[PDB]
Inverse folding.
């Protein structure tokens, strides 16, 4: 029985690989060969945000493209005003080992979580004015590695117990559970319509999940090591992944295969964070060698470098209007870069 | 046992993921190329923006 | 060709001093992580004192030596005050550095909870105030010269009094602190080697002690060899016996310690790396 | 533009109020030492935590001689491939607890502890972190060695050629047989510790018991030694 099922699974994998090979006609490099290159991208640090006492692990932009939240391994959750550099809030956390944070699209909530295996929701607009915990989401048996608000009442979280979950914040219950990864899930990315999301785990695979249906529709392979970062293309029909093998890859949902690889010979450190520009032409990625590289998404050519962080670049983010880029780092500083 | 259940679940999942419809890579690559062209003007990082309307100066 | 060689050597010495101490002062502005430590506060204080030695004292004495006479008129008194003040500040900065290192090594917890930057400012201010008081107050009142470049000798009362404050007490303090540091390091080395020997014996020391002795001997020997003969002839001469040339040689030996100070106190991995980033940005 | 001026004034006032509180937190953060606690379920790691105090991660705060300590337990539904091990790359020390009496229990639990210690020692994120090794449950080990048919050489064949070292300080009332086993296990851990040492971190082994009032002092003294050695190393004196 076991031999029969193993043979059947191997035959199905062979059929899938054969279909993917058959559907491959031309590479992305061949198609985007007459496109004029973007040239050289020159960005400068417009702002520098200070106030965190320890390494910064996560940051997130608000939908108004002005306010942003960041998380540090000192029990602090700071909300900034990026235009005027002022600090709007500073939330002390019960647990000091936070690893993720999110900003609600409405702007009335922020989320947080880490090694405590809890996702905490904070109310930013309340009667008292002081920020207080609204809900604690328990049920994961591993560290919280990512969370993303769908609306004011739903949030999707990924965990180190190889599981992603969808929550109802009002009741604090898991509405759906997404299983299938064998390694620890490290990152999440919601589609523009919040109807699908992709996750990347430590089994060097990425999966596409139906939020309402609760099933895995596609699985993407090609990375030789742990996937640490994942991001949807602005179109919503492709996504990019960053791994420890010092490479970034682009996958197409409809083609169901990898299209381009973003690697250089003098890069050996892993990618911590990855992000796209508003047009989707630029691919920004953070690295362990303390700087962020800018890639041409259609040519796989490095179009620039953002340097000026004293330590590891841990997090990265592009505003909803495309105006600015924020990078946080283990040197406890947030930098904002503009064209 | 649980091993046979895991194996049959994996086989069943592999059955569903092989039933999807796939377009050619030529069509998929053209769609991404066309999206960048139609939105290249409104990308402040791709095309540098004058300081008149830049809020980070 | 003797004069040409003397001018070249003095120019090289002044340039070495100025370049090295400027590099030390610059490596702290470019990097904000070095400014987070207090030991670096004391190091930059010493670098500032060495720069003042190289700017306000050394060139004017070298001009008089190359020319063969003092051409600066009534600048002799102000120059003597600058000489005393800058040298004293250098030696007191060295003493404070040694005391800071001893407190860090011997009481790490009380050091971390009591070495706030407010205390460092108090120590630096005390050192510089002592320098200014010992130099400018007695010189302006002509207490330094005998009653009965610019090549005179100090008074008998002022020579011994200033030497005791500027040299002998700081030397005693530095000897005590570095002896205690050596004892602590020896205990730690023995304790480490005991476990290493136990593990080796389970499977089937002199280098560290040599390194400790090398570091400590370099520090102490450079300081003492540069400044000790000057402070002996500074008290032998007022009671006179030597000429005015060997004394000038020993004065120059004393000043040349400021040249070597950057590579003894600002040459760790953090400073060496910062000295390469500023060297061509490679 | 008086409304804009009032808004900016309120924003500056709120920022200043926030930054006042961040200044005290910086003072508290610098005086605190963070400890990562490792071990197994069968080790007496839980009882030691209870003595120190007297879901996910568990945190314990205690203070000795005006020094604040912050110890974290990572025994929360974990497994191998410790991806979260990079969160603790700047702690003062690691407390590794071993049940020394579990050599006979089953593939041995002591061999599992040795493998875990070797894995942690050679971790790339923990290359400047020292380990305070607690060789726990000495009373049970003494009882097993003194009376019983569980021969240590049966499970570890190298015990048939082991001799108690010269730097051994047995308790006055201990049998010579008990001392040999204790120091054999200690040297078994020390061989791993010194076979791959970098000079940037050390191991501090202790013979402990779960119910001891000395373990807090042991942690305090070992952390003091760690900081002193770091200071000596930064001045090229070690
Ligand atoms: C060299 C020189 C001098 C002179 N200046 C200063 C001097 O004492 C000190 N120097 C350095 C550091 C010190 O700390 C405490 C005392 C002290 C002794 C001296 F002999 N004088 C007076 C002169 O007229 N012509 C000269 O060339």
């Amino acid at each position: 029985e076991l031999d029969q099922l193993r043979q059947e699974a191997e035959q199905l994998k062979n059929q899938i690989r054969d279909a993917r090979k058959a559907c491959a006609d031309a590479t992305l490099s061949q198609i985007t060969n007459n496109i004029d290159p973007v040239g050289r991208i020159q960005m400068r640090t417009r702002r520098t945000l200070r106030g965190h006492l320890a390494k910064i692990y996560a940051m997130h932009w608000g939908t108004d493209s002005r306010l942003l939240v960041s998380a540090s391994q000192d029990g602090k959750l700071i909300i900034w005003d990026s235009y005027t550099t002022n600090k709007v809030h500073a939330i002390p956390l019960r647990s000091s080992w936070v690893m993720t944070c999110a900003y609600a699209p409405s702007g009335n909530y922020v989320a947080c979580g880490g090694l405590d295996n809890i996702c905490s929701i904070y109310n930013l607009k309340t009667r008292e004015g002081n920020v207080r915990v609204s809900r604690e989401l328990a049920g994961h048996t591993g560290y919280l590695s990512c969370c993303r608000f769908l609306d004011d009442n739903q949030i999707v979280t990924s965990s180190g117990d190889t599981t992603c979950a969808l929550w109802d914040i009002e009741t604090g219950q898991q509405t759906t559970t997404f299983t299938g990864h064998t390694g620890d899930v490290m990152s999440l990315s919601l589609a523009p319509d919040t109807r699908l999301f992709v996750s990347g785990a430590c089994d060097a695979s990425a999966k596409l999940w139906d939020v309402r249906e609760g099933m895995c529709r596609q699985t993407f392979t090609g990375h030789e090591s742990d996937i640490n970062a994942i991001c949807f293309f602005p179109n919503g029909n492709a996504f990019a992944t960053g791994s420890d093998d010092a490479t970034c890859r682009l996958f197409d949902l409809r083609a169901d295969q990898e299209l381009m690889t973003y690697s250089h010979d003098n890069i050996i450190c892993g990618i911590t964070s990855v992000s796209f520009s508003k047009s989707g032409r630029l691919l920004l990625a953070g690295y362990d060698d303390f700087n962020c590289n800018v890639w041409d998404a259609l040519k796989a050519d490095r179009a620039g470098v953002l340097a000026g962080h004293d330590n590891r670049v841990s997090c990265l983010g592009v505003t909803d209007d495309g105006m600015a880029v924020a990078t946080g780092s283990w040197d406890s500083f947030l930098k904002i870069w503009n064209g | 046992t649980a091993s046979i259940a895991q194996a049959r679940k994996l086989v069943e999942q592999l059955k569903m993921e092989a039933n999807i419809d796939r377009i050619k890579v030529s069509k998929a690559a053209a769609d991404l190329m066309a999206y960048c062209e139609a939105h290249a003007k409104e990308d402040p990082l791709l095309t540098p923006v004058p300081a008149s309307e830049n809020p980070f100066r | 060709s003797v004069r040409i060689l003397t001018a070249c050597f003095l120019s090289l010495l002044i340039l070495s001093t100025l370049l090295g101490n400027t590099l030390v002062c610059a490596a702290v502005i470019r990097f904000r992580h070095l400014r987070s430590k207090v030991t670096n506060f004391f190091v930059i204080s010493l670098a500032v004192s060495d720069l003042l030695v190289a700017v306000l004292v050394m060139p004017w004495k070298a001009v008089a030596e190359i020319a063969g006479f003092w051409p600066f008129g009534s600048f002799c008194n102000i120059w003597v005050a600058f000489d005393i003040m800058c040298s004293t500040a250098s030696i007191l900065n060295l003493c404070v550095i040694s005391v800071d290192r001893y407190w860090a090594i011997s009481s790490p917890f009380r050091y971390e909870r009591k070495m706030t930057p407010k205390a460092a400012f108090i120590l630096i201010s005390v050192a510089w105030t002592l320098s200014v008081l010992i130099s400018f107050i007695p010189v302006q009142l002509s207490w330094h010269k005998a009653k009965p470049n610019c090549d005179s000798s100090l008074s008998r009362t002022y020579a011994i009094s200033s030497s005791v404050i500027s040299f002998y007490i700081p030397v005693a303090i530095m000897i005590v602190t570095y002896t205690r540091i050596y004892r602590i390091a020896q205990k730690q080395i023995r304790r480490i080697a005991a476990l290493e020997r136990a593990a080796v014996h389970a499977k089937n020391s002199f280098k560290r002690e040599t390194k400790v002795l090398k570091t400590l001997s370099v520090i102490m020997g450079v300081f003492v060899c540069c400044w000790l003969p000057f402070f002996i002839l500074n008290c032998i001469l007022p009671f006179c016996c030597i000429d005015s040339n060997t004394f000038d040689v020993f004065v120059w030996f004393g000043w040349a310690n400021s040249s070597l100070n950057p590579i003894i106190y600002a040459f760790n991995a953090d400073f060496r790396k910062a000295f390469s980033t500023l060297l061509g940005c490679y | 533009t008086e409304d804009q001026r009032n808004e900016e004034k309120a924003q500056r006032e709120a920022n200043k109020k926030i930054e006042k509180q961040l200044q005290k937190d910086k003072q508290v953060y610098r005086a605190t030492h963070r400890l990562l606690l490792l071990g197994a379920g069968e080790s007496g790691k839980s009882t030691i935590v209870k003595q120190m105090r007297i879901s996910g991660i568990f945190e314990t705060k205690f203070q000795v001689d005006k020094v604040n300590f912050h110890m974290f337990d990572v025994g929360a539904q974990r497994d191998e491939r410790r991806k979260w091990i990079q969160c603790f790359n700047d702690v003062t020390a690691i407390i590794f607890v071993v049940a020394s009496s579990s050599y006979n229990m089953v593939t041995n639990r002591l061999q599992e502890a040795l493998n875990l210690f070797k894995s942690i020692w050679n971790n790339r994120w923990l290359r400047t972190i020292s380990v305070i090794l607690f060789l726990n449950k000495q009373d049970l080990l003494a009882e097993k060695v003194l009376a019983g048919k569980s021969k240590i050489e049966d499970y570890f064949p190298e015990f048939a050629r082991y001799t108690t070292p010269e730097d051994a300080t047995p308790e006055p009332g201990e049998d010579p047989r008990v001392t040999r086993a204790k120091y054999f296990i200690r040297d078994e851990f020390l061989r791993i510790s010194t076979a791959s040492g970098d000079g940037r971190h050390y191991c501090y082994p202790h013979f402990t018991c779960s119910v001891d009032t000395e373990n807090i002092r042991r942690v305090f003294n070992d952390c003091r030694d760690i900081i002193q050695r770091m200071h000596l190393r930064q001045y090229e004196l070690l």
User: Anything to note?
Assistant: The domain at 41-338 of chain A is CATH 2.130.10.10 (Methylamine Dehydrogenase; Chain H).
